Amino acid sequence: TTALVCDNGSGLVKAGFAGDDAPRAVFPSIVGRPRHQGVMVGMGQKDSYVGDEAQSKRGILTLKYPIEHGIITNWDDMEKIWHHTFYNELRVAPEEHPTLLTEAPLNPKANREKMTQIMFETFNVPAMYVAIQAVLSLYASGRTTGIVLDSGDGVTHNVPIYEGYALPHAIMRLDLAGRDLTDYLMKILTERGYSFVTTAEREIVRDIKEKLCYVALDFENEMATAASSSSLEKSYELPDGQVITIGNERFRCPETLFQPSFIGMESAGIHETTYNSIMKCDIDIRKDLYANNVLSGGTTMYPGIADRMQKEITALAPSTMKIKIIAPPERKYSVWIGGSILASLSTFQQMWISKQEYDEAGPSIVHRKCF
Amino acid sequence: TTALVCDNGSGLVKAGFAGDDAPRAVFPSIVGRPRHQGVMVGMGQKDSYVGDEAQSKRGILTLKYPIEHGIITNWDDMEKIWHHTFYNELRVAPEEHPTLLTEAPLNPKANREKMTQIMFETFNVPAMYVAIQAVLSLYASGRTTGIVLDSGDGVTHNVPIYEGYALPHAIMRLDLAGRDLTDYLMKILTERGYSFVTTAEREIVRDIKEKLCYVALDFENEMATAASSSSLEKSYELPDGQVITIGNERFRCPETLFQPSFIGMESAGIHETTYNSIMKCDIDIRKDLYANNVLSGGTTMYPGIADRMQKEITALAPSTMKIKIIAPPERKYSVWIGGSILASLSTFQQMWISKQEYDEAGPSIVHRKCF
Amino acid sequence: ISASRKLQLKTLMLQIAKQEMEREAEERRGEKGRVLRTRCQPLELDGLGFEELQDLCRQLHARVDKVDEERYDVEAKVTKNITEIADLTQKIYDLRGKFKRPTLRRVRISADAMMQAL
Amino acid sequence: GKRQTEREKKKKILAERRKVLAIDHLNEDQLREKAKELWQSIYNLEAEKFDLQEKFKQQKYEINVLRNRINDNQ
Amino acid sequence: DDIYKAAVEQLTEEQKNEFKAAFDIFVLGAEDGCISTKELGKVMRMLGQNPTPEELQEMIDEVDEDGSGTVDFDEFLVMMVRCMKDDSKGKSEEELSDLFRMFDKNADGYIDLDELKMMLQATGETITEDDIEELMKDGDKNNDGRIDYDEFLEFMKGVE
Ligand SMILES: Nc1ncnc2c1ncn2[C@@H]1O[C@H](COP(=O)(O)OP(=O)(O)O)[C@@H](O)[C@H]1O
Ligand SMILES: Nc1ncnc2c1ncn2[C@@H]1O[C@H](COP(=O)(O)OP(=O)(O)O)[C@@H](O)[C@H]1O
Ligand SMILES: [Mg+2]
Ligand SMILES: [Mg+2]
């Protein structure tokens, strides 16, 4: 039979059968209970709208993501999300399909063990396998080397790989991602008068960020230009009218990636954690990693980031090496495409964690040889 | 049929069919298992890369030479190296070809007996013969007398020969060679800030030594000059950029040959062990040995050694004798060229150790008349 | 340098190549026929005692066993060369798969067309 | 690899392929028929082996071109 | 070559529906008398899914190479083949390997330039600017005069 390549993510759940080009169903991972009282009788009001249904009734819900930073903080809601994904968005019972979840690097063990225990006890799948979210993104590019920066919505991690041999001592995981950029944008919009507070209006700020923000090639020059002319002010129409005008908030929101001091984080930007991740590698594979830097994940879709990052790394790196940044147009679904490719391989067909194996060793089987 | 003139050496395996000018395949003798974990599936990752393949993937391997000082310390790896040499670099099955290995003087017997046992049992050659590495280097020069200093990469030995009669009581074998010079260079580079530690970076230090180091004609004058001017500082580009500048480390690394007290060895330099080897000979053949001093081996390729050695010996020797140092341009492959010449001789064709002879007397046949 | 001229030239040369490939195939077929015909060693089957008939057929049995043994040896050797070819195929496919390995997949079924139903 | 085992397999096949027939187990004419049957089987075997040699020559072709490309990579 | 096989395989269940539906949609007549002899453009425009331009150009040129300017049922099927993916799709890579084996039957480790010369002599195509140029550039893809296997391998690959 065919395998189910699910990809929990944090912000958008992407799923679909193995062997295709794009995920079959992509929908936000939010579960929102209603918060008001409700007076109409017999309206058929449910107790929790999940997935894309709660992005249409979000006016009277309190949306809450079940995955904070890679890790899962609310297991009941995550179980509900998985149940919805299997039964309503794909309509395939899990009793007859292997599953291939994905997990960020350096995550707590208990999260992974609980994930496999749920998949084997509640949904009762035949066999499931958990894979690191960066190796798949490297599969999708058709490479076999390279250092991949997978800046998702929950957590940004940077896994270097050479000739198929991952370097476990050079993984640099940073917890700044799309959600913190949304919060920072929502916080700097208040400097013009627009106040978004409700958890429903966070979605509106996210839409503003997606449609308007861009990464500046040079920050100081853009700050000077936006403060003199008015060629940058782009307007946007809220879900009820009252258009708003975003000035130099456009390139200040995604600039937080390269200067995490804006949101008070100490660490260095995504332009310098990649160079540090390279320098921890051996001295003889640094040229190949320099030449095959891969971008993935949703948050790396800002217009103009593949040039800013290349300029920064070229500034840091030695002058002789060639710096090349691979930015495929299908960046958002790169991890899932790689997952489909991996699940479609014949050599991989014996790596699944078969159910009888789980029955013999318990949920701690995932840390064992079947990784 | 044709004979296989293999030459194990220590650092570079040189092989080729008898009767040519240069070895057919020359490649480092290193076997390196991978050391990291490896995450890509189906990449076709082998368990041990040998020969010149492991000089390209050395970034994720742990290279380890199977021959320490002439002697062989790891028989499985040496067998792997031989198998590679026969099947992939020459592509001739050993079942149909005699072999002519080479061995340093004064080596342990068990090494030679195990070598012949392997060649007769595993590879199953028709007949093999083991020859001393210095007599061949004397063949290649077209002489029949002379005292040859064969400073390889493992061990430096100095065999005097007159009129074809070797003098077994005058062989002076010293264990300082190219590898110790590489280690000493790697140890003195730390005085400028460059630290090479990994077994892969030993190859980089070896390349630095080959391309930059030279032997000073007079040591104190060079030490004084390099400490005042800056006309010696030559720069070199690492495999990733960050050029380095070598100052008076240039002629201090190969100076260890003439003053083995630098690396803590007690013995006298290669300039004085040759004179001692001569003085042990009879009083009537010392003039001929003085006039026909032969250099061979890789490590004698330093620019300016054929003059320093001549100056030193002229200082030691009596003033009347003429001191001449034969330094052919084909020094590195001198032993193998001599091996080809010896294997191509008709008079030598009945000295091979035929397999039936080995079956009758066991591996201890090599010490017998068939030397 | 014209594209039309280039395509005409490559088309004609490709067809000549295909014709010569069929020519080589039928040439090998004829060579095989000749080799099989010349393999047979005819025997004078008539006017011999039946025990001699059994003897001769047993001798041919020994010949057959030896010949099939030679075939086994050459098949094993070509099989080892097959393993070597597989290794070298792994080498080239790895060197190129570093960029074009995941091309093996199934795409363009229903998401690319069925979209207005939702 | 480990020619003793390979030769062992060869001898197992040959002893298996040593279809020695007994005395009163055919007709003289049937004996001729079986002899010719072996003849034709071995002729087909020779055709297969000849094509095998052709394909092995092509294998050598691929080997030399492959190693030449390998050297070109350096 | 594969052209006639693709033409015969046009008789199927999907492309039959495609031809029928297209005929019922935008093949009727009742024009001003201009005679849409070049209605292949109409079909390509009305397809709604343009294939790779190679099929379209082969239909444009290869069809009516005599300049008939008329399309019949068989040519309708030819156009329908040009619509869907009925191509041989580069023939068989085994064909490429066997062809290069016949080329370097001399065991040069590559298709020698003289192999190309003899093949051109057999094909007899006039030596134009493209002639010899293709041979040399393929042989000198490294631009060093050295002809390697993969050079002509990719030179002949991608074509039927
Ligand atoms: N076109 C876009 N431009 C800018 N940001 C985007 C765009 N699309 C998505 N994002 C950001 O990326 C996030 C989605 O990232 P995604 O890759 O789905 O995370 P995950 O790894 O959990 O799947 C969204 O929250 C959004 O903030
Ligand atoms: N051009 C060169 N200049 C200086 N040193 C060299 C040069 N070439 C080789 N060497 C040294 O000689 C060694 C090779 O010696 P070689 O003669 O191959 O040893 P063996 O006797 O084991 O074959 C290398 O390790 C290197 O350190
Ligand atoms: Mg992700
Ligand atoms: Mg030597």
mmCIF file with all atom_site columns, C-alpha atoms in Angstrom, chain B residues 16-161:
data_model
loop_
_atom_site.group_PDB
_atom_site.id
_atom_site.type_symbol
_atom_site.label_atom_id
_atom_site.label_alt_id
_atom_site.label_comp_id
_atom_site.label_asym_id
_atom_site.label_entity_id
_atom_site.label_seq_id
_atom_site.pdbx_PDB_ins_code
_atom_site.Cartn_x
_atom_site.Cartn_y
_atom_site.Cartn_z
_atom_site.occupancy
_atom_site.B_iso_or_equiv
_atom_site.pdbx_formal_charge
_atom_site.auth_seq_id
_atom_site.auth_comp_id
_atom_site.auth_asym_id
_atom_site.auth_atom_id
_atom_site.pdbx_PDB_model_num
ATOM 1   C CA . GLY B 1 16  ? 53.357 -1.317  -12.334 1.00 0.00 ? 16  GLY B CA 1
ATOM 2   C CA . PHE B 1 17  ? 54.321 -3.960  -14.825 1.00 0.00 ? 17  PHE B CA 1
ATOM 3   C CA . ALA B 1 18  ? 57.975 -4.846  -15.247 1.00 0.00 ? 18  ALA B CA 1
ATOM 4   C CA . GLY B 1 19  ? 59.827 -3.207  -18.106 1.00 0.00 ? 19  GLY B CA 1
ATOM 5   C CA . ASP B 1 20  ? 58.409 0.312   -18.115 1.00 0.00 ? 20  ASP B CA 1
ATOM 6   C CA . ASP B 1 21  ? 59.842 3.644   -17.037 1.00 0.00 ? 21  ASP B CA 1
ATOM 7   C CA . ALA B 1 22  ? 57.387 4.767   -14.358 1.00 0.00 ? 22  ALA B CA 1
ATOM 8   C CA . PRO B 1 23  ? 54.932 3.050   -12.011 1.00 0.00 ? 23  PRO B CA 1
ATOM 9   C CA . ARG B 1 24  ? 51.458 2.721   -13.453 1.00 0.00 ? 24  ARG B CA 1
ATOM 10  C CA . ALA B 1 25  ? 49.510 3.669   -10.313 1.00 0.00 ? 25  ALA B CA 1
ATOM 11  C CA . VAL B 1 26  ? 50.845 5.725   -7.402  1.00 0.00 ? 26  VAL B CA 1
ATOM 12  C CA . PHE B 1 27  ? 48.480 6.432   -4.527  1.00 0.00 ? 27  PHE B CA 1
ATOM 13  C CA . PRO B 1 28  ? 48.753 6.989   -0.772  1.00 0.00 ? 28  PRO B CA 1
ATOM 14  C CA . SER B 1 29  ? 48.510 3.898   1.407   1.00 0.00 ? 29  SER B CA 1
ATOM 15  C CA . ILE B 1 30  ? 45.800 4.904   3.868   1.00 0.00 ? 30  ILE B CA 1
ATOM 16  C CA . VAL B 1 31  ? 42.612 3.119   4.900   1.00 0.00 ? 31  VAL B CA 1
ATOM 17  C CA . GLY B 1 32  ? 40.016 5.313   6.530   1.00 0.00 ? 32  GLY B CA 1
ATOM 18  C CA . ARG B 1 33  ? 36.773 4.201   8.112   1.00 0.00 ? 33  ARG B CA 1
ATOM 19  C CA . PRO B 1 34  ? 34.053 6.851   8.393   1.00 0.00 ? 34  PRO B CA 1
ATOM 20  C CA . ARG B 1 35  ? 33.625 8.255   11.877  1.00 0.00 ? 35  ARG B CA 1
ATOM 21  C CA . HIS B 1 36  ? 30.315 10.153  11.892  1.00 0.00 ? 36  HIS B CA 1
ATOM 22  C CA . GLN B 1 37  ? 26.851 8.623   11.861  1.00 0.00 ? 37  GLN B CA 1
ATOM 23  C CA . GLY B 1 38  ? 25.381 9.113   8.401   1.00 0.00 ? 38  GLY B CA 1
ATOM 24  C CA . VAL B 1 39  ? 21.754 10.009  7.787   1.00 0.00 ? 39  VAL B CA 1
ATOM 25  C CA . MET B 1 40  ? 21.187 9.761   4.030   1.00 0.00 ? 40  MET B CA 1
ATOM 26  C CA . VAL B 1 41  ? 19.795 6.363   3.125   1.00 0.00 ? 41  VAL B CA 1
ATOM 27  C CA . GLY B 1 42  ? 20.839 4.520   0.005   1.00 0.00 ? 42  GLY B CA 1
ATOM 28  C CA . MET B 1 43  ? 23.778 6.830   -0.632  1.00 0.00 ? 43  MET B CA 1
ATOM 29  C CA . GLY B 1 44  ? 25.948 3.762   -1.179  1.00 0.00 ? 44  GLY B CA 1
ATOM 30  C CA . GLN B 1 45  ? 28.316 4.460   1.697   1.00 0.00 ? 45  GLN B CA 1
ATOM 31  C CA . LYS B 1 46  ? 31.118 1.926   2.003   1.00 0.00 ? 46  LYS B CA 1
ATOM 32  C CA . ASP B 1 47  ? 32.788 0.836   5.221   1.00 0.00 ? 47  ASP B CA 1
ATOM 33  C CA . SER B 1 48  ? 36.387 1.668   4.260   1.00 0.00 ? 48  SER B CA 1
ATOM 34  C CA . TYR B 1 49  ? 37.820 3.910   1.553   1.00 0.00 ? 49  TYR B CA 1
ATOM 35  C CA . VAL B 1 50  ? 41.380 2.981   0.638   1.00 0.00 ? 50  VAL B CA 1
ATOM 36  C CA . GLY B 1 51  ? 43.998 4.512   -1.555  1.00 0.00 ? 51  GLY B CA 1
ATOM 37  C CA . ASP B 1 52  ? 43.409 7.740   -3.409  1.00 0.00 ? 52  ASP B CA 1
ATOM 38  C CA . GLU B 1 53  ? 39.666 7.649   -2.762  1.00 0.00 ? 53  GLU B CA 1
ATOM 39  C CA . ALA B 1 54  ? 40.217 8.424   0.924   1.00 0.00 ? 54  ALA B CA 1
ATOM 40  C CA . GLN B 1 55  ? 42.265 11.493  0.062   1.00 0.00 ? 55  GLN B CA 1
ATOM 41  C CA . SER B 1 56  ? 39.135 13.112  -1.363  1.00 0.00 ? 56  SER B CA 1
ATOM 42  C CA . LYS B 1 57  ? 36.653 12.159  1.373   1.00 0.00 ? 57  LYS B CA 1
ATOM 43  C CA . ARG B 1 58  ? 39.197 12.781  4.110   1.00 0.00 ? 58  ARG B CA 1
ATOM 44  C CA . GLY B 1 59  ? 36.973 15.385  5.688   1.00 0.00 ? 59  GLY B CA 1
ATOM 45  C CA . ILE B 1 60  ? 34.806 12.734  7.345   1.00 0.00 ? 60  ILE B CA 1
ATOM 46  C CA . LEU B 1 61  ? 37.288 9.839   7.669   1.00 0.00 ? 61  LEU B CA 1
ATOM 47  C CA . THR B 1 62  ? 39.966 8.820   10.142  1.00 0.00 ? 62  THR B CA 1
ATOM 48  C CA . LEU B 1 63  ? 42.905 7.902   7.919   1.00 0.00 ? 63  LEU B CA 1
ATOM 49  C CA . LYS B 1 64  ? 45.401 5.474   9.425   1.00 0.00 ? 64  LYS B CA 1
ATOM 50  C CA . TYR B 1 65  ? 48.512 4.195   7.703   1.00 0.00 ? 65  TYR B CA 1
ATOM 51  C CA . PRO B 1 66  ? 48.935 0.407   7.920   1.00 0.00 ? 66  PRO B CA 1
ATOM 52  C CA . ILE B 1 67  ? 52.763 0.597   7.835   1.00 0.00 ? 67  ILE B CA 1
ATOM 53  C CA . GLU B 1 68  ? 54.464 2.419   10.697  1.00 0.00 ? 68  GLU B CA 1
ATOM 54  C CA . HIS B 1 69  ? 58.251 2.164   10.230  1.00 0.00 ? 69  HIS B CA 1
ATOM 55  C CA . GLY B 1 70  ? 58.904 -0.255  7.422   1.00 0.00 ? 70  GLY B CA 1
ATOM 56  C CA . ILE B 1 71  ? 57.240 -2.973  9.484   1.00 0.00 ? 71  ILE B CA 1
ATOM 57  C CA . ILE B 1 72  ? 53.539 -3.669  9.020   1.00 0.00 ? 72  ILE B CA 1
ATOM 58  C CA . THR B 1 73  ? 51.433 -3.215  12.138  1.00 0.00 ? 73  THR B CA 1
ATOM 59  C CA . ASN B 1 74  ? 47.909 -3.933  10.849  1.00 0.00 ? 74  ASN B CA 1
ATOM 60  C CA . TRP B 1 75  ? 47.765 -6.948  8.572   1.00 0.00 ? 75  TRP B CA 1
ATOM 61  C CA . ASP B 1 76  ? 44.089 -6.748  7.648   1.00 0.00 ? 76  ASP B CA 1
ATOM 62  C CA . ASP B 1 77  ? 44.469 -3.196  6.340   1.00 0.00 ? 77  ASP B CA 1
ATOM 63  C CA . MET B 1 78  ? 47.605 -4.133  4.419   1.00 0.00 ? 78  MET B CA 1
ATOM 64  C CA . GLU B 1 79  ? 45.739 -7.019  2.813   1.00 0.00 ? 79  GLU B CA 1
ATOM 65  C CA . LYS B 1 80  ? 42.989 -4.593  1.842   1.00 0.00 ? 80  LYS B CA 1
ATOM 66  C CA . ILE B 1 81  ? 45.552 -2.241  0.304   1.00 0.00 ? 81  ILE B CA 1
ATOM 67  C CA . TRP B 1 82  ? 47.110 -5.048  -1.717  1.00 0.00 ? 82  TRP B CA 1
ATOM 68  C CA . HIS B 1 83  ? 43.712 -6.236  -2.915  1.00 0.00 ? 83  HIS B CA 1
ATOM 69  C CA . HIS B 1 84  ? 42.858 -2.728  -4.074  1.00 0.00 ? 84  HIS B CA 1
ATOM 70  C CA . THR B 1 85  ? 46.220 -2.353  -5.797  1.00 0.00 ? 85  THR B CA 1
ATOM 71  C CA . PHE B 1 86  ? 45.851 -5.572  -7.748  1.00 0.00 ? 86  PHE B CA 1
ATOM 72  C CA . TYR B 1 87  ? 42.211 -5.385  -8.724  1.00 0.00 ? 87  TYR B CA 1
ATOM 73  C CA . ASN B 1 88  ? 41.311 -1.707  -9.189  1.00 0.00 ? 88  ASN B CA 1
ATOM 74  C CA . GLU B 1 89  ? 44.512 0.195   -9.962  1.00 0.00 ? 89  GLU B CA 1
ATOM 75  C CA . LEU B 1 90  ? 46.010 -2.423  -12.300 1.00 0.00 ? 90  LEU B CA 1
ATOM 76  C CA . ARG B 1 91  ? 43.003 -4.666  -13.030 1.00 0.00 ? 91  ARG B CA 1
ATOM 77  C CA . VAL B 1 92  ? 45.125 -7.797  -13.427 1.00 0.00 ? 92  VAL B CA 1
ATOM 78  C CA . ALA B 1 93  ? 44.259 -10.904 -11.506 1.00 0.00 ? 93  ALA B CA 1
ATOM 79  C CA . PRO B 1 94  ? 47.275 -12.072 -9.472  1.00 0.00 ? 94  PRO B CA 1
ATOM 80  C CA . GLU B 1 95  ? 46.780 -15.709 -10.470 1.00 0.00 ? 95  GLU B CA 1
ATOM 81  C CA . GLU B 1 96  ? 48.792 -15.092 -13.643 1.00 0.00 ? 96  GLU B CA 1
ATOM 82  C CA . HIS B 1 97  ? 51.612 -12.792 -12.608 1.00 0.00 ? 97  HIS B CA 1
ATOM 83  C CA . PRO B 1 98  ? 54.809 -13.018 -10.552 1.00 0.00 ? 98  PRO B CA 1
ATOM 84  C CA . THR B 1 99  ? 55.280 -10.326 -7.924  1.00 0.00 ? 99  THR B CA 1
ATOM 85  C CA . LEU B 1 100 ? 58.408 -8.576  -6.632  1.00 0.00 ? 100 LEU B CA 1
ATOM 86  C CA . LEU B 1 101 ? 57.825 -6.921  -3.270  1.00 0.00 ? 101 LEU B CA 1
ATOM 87  C CA . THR B 1 102 ? 60.381 -4.688  -1.566  1.00 0.00 ? 102 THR B CA 1
ATOM 88  C CA . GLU B 1 103 ? 61.428 -4.587  2.080   1.00 0.00 ? 103 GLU B CA 1
ATOM 89  C CA . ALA B 1 104 ? 63.628 -2.341  4.181   1.00 0.00 ? 104 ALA B CA 1
ATOM 90  C CA . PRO B 1 105 ? 66.864 -3.764  5.601   1.00 0.00 ? 105 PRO B CA 1
ATOM 91  C CA . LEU B 1 106 ? 67.014 -5.134  9.144   1.00 0.00 ? 106 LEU B CA 1
ATOM 92  C CA . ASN B 1 107 ? 63.262 -5.671  9.398   1.00 0.00 ? 107 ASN B CA 1
ATOM 93  C CA . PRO B 1 108 ? 61.635 -8.308  11.622  1.00 0.00 ? 108 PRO B CA 1
ATOM 94  C CA . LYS B 1 109 ? 61.466 -11.752 10.095  1.00 0.00 ? 109 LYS B CA 1
ATOM 95  C CA . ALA B 1 110 ? 57.811 -12.314 10.949  1.00 0.00 ? 110 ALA B CA 1
ATOM 96  C CA . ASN B 1 111 ? 56.853 -9.372  8.749   1.00 0.00 ? 111 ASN B CA 1
ATOM 97  C CA . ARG B 1 112 ? 58.526 -10.886 5.693   1.00 0.00 ? 112 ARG B CA 1
ATOM 98  C CA . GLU B 1 113 ? 57.200 -14.391 6.359   1.00 0.00 ? 113 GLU B CA 1
ATOM 99  C CA . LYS B 1 114 ? 53.643 -13.117 6.810   1.00 0.00 ? 114 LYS B CA 1
ATOM 100 C CA . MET B 1 115 ? 54.003 -11.112 3.604   1.00 0.00 ? 115 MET B CA 1
ATOM 101 C CA . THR B 1 116 ? 54.972 -14.181 1.603   1.00 0.00 ? 116 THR B CA 1
ATOM 102 C CA . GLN B 1 117 ? 52.281 -16.296 3.259   1.00 0.00 ? 117 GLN B CA 1
ATOM 103 C CA . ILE B 1 118 ? 49.620 -13.751 2.321   1.00 0.00 ? 118 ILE B CA 1
ATOM 104 C CA . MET B 1 119 ? 50.863 -13.477 -1.251  1.00 0.00 ? 119 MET B CA 1
ATOM 105 C CA . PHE B 1 120 ? 50.819 -17.253 -1.655  1.00 0.00 ? 120 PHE B CA 1
ATOM 106 C CA . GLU B 1 121 ? 47.582 -18.114 0.141   1.00 0.00 ? 121 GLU B CA 1
ATOM 107 C CA . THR B 1 122 ? 45.167 -15.219 -0.298  1.00 0.00 ? 122 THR B CA 1
ATOM 108 C CA . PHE B 1 123 ? 46.131 -13.755 -3.668  1.00 0.00 ? 123 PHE B CA 1
ATOM 109 C CA . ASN B 1 124 ? 47.620 -17.069 -4.854  1.00 0.00 ? 124 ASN B CA 1
ATOM 110 C CA . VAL B 1 125 ? 50.382 -15.655 -7.062  1.00 0.00 ? 125 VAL B CA 1
ATOM 111 C CA . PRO B 1 126 ? 52.565 -18.001 -9.138  1.00 0.00 ? 126 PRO B CA 1
ATOM 112 C CA . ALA B 1 127 ? 55.852 -16.839 -7.582  1.00 0.00 ? 127 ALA B CA 1
ATOM 113 C CA . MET B 1 128 ? 57.036 -13.896 -5.479  1.00 0.00 ? 128 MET B CA 1
ATOM 114 C CA . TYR B 1 129 ? 60.437 -12.512 -4.526  1.00 0.00 ? 129 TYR B CA 1
ATOM 115 C CA . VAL B 1 130 ? 61.419 -10.001 -1.839  1.00 0.00 ? 130 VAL B CA 1
ATOM 116 C CA . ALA B 1 131 ? 64.283 -7.587  -2.459  1.00 0.00 ? 131 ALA B CA 1
ATOM 117 C CA . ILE B 1 132 ? 66.076 -5.024  -0.308  1.00 0.00 ? 132 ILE B CA 1
ATOM 118 C CA . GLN B 1 133 ? 64.984 -1.494  -1.149  1.00 0.00 ? 133 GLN B CA 1
ATOM 119 C CA . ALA B 1 134 ? 68.514 -0.151  -1.582  1.00 0.00 ? 134 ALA B CA 1
ATOM 120 C CA . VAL B 1 135 ? 69.918 -2.621  -4.107  1.00 0.00 ? 135 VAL B CA 1
ATOM 121 C CA . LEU B 1 136 ? 67.141 -1.640  -6.491  1.00 0.00 ? 136 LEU B CA 1
ATOM 122 C CA . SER B 1 137 ? 67.939 2.047   -6.115  1.00 0.00 ? 137 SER B CA 1
ATOM 123 C CA . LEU B 1 138 ? 71.496 1.126   -7.000  1.00 0.00 ? 138 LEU B CA 1
ATOM 124 C CA . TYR B 1 139 ? 70.253 -0.744  -10.076 1.00 0.00 ? 139 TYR B CA 1
ATOM 125 C CA . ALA B 1 140 ? 68.363 2.300   -11.309 1.00 0.00 ? 140 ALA B CA 1
ATOM 126 C CA . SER B 1 141 ? 71.479 4.484   -11.247 1.00 0.00 ? 141 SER B CA 1
ATOM 127 C CA . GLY B 1 142 ? 73.200 2.064   -13.608 1.00 0.00 ? 142 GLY B CA 1
ATOM 128 C CA . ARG B 1 143 ? 76.122 1.692   -11.211 1.00 0.00 ? 143 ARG B CA 1
ATOM 129 C CA . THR B 1 144 ? 77.546 -1.394  -9.599  1.00 0.00 ? 144 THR B CA 1
ATOM 130 C CA . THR B 1 145 ? 79.247 0.198   -6.572  1.00 0.00 ? 145 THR B CA 1
ATOM 131 C CA . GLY B 1 146 ? 78.355 3.059   -4.302  1.00 0.00 ? 146 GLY B CA 1
ATOM 132 C CA . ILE B 1 147 ? 76.688 3.689   -0.963  1.00 0.00 ? 147 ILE B CA 1
ATOM 133 C CA . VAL B 1 148 ? 72.993 4.483   -1.281  1.00 0.00 ? 148 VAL B CA 1
ATOM 134 C CA . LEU B 1 149 ? 71.059 6.572   1.252   1.00 0.00 ? 149 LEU B CA 1
ATOM 135 C CA . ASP B 1 150 ? 67.389 5.703   0.752   1.00 0.00 ? 150 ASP B CA 1
ATOM 136 C CA . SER B 1 151 ? 65.534 8.186   2.932   1.00 0.00 ? 151 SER B CA 1
ATOM 137 C CA . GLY B 1 152 ? 61.953 7.067   2.450   1.00 0.00 ? 152 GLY B CA 1
ATOM 138 C CA . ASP B 1 153 ? 58.909 8.155   4.400   1.00 0.00 ? 153 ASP B CA 1
ATOM 139 C CA . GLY B 1 154 ? 59.028 5.403   6.987   1.00 0.00 ? 154 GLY B CA 1
ATOM 140 C CA . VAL B 1 155 ? 62.694 4.657   7.616   1.00 0.00 ? 155 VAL B CA 1
ATOM 141 C CA . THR B 1 156 ? 66.068 5.908   6.378   1.00 0.00 ? 156 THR B CA 1
ATOM 142 C CA . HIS B 1 157 ? 68.650 3.204   5.678   1.00 0.00 ? 157 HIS B CA 1
ATOM 143 C CA . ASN B 1 158 ? 72.138 3.413   4.221   1.00 0.00 ? 158 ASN B CA 1
ATOM 144 C CA . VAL B 1 159 ? 73.410 0.283   2.455   1.00 0.00 ? 159 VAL B CA 1
ATOM 145 C CA . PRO B 1 160 ? 76.979 0.321   1.076   1.00 0.00 ? 160 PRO B CA 1
ATOM 146 C CA . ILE B 1 161 ? 77.758 -1.929  -1.876  1.00 0.00 ? 161 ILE B CA 1
#
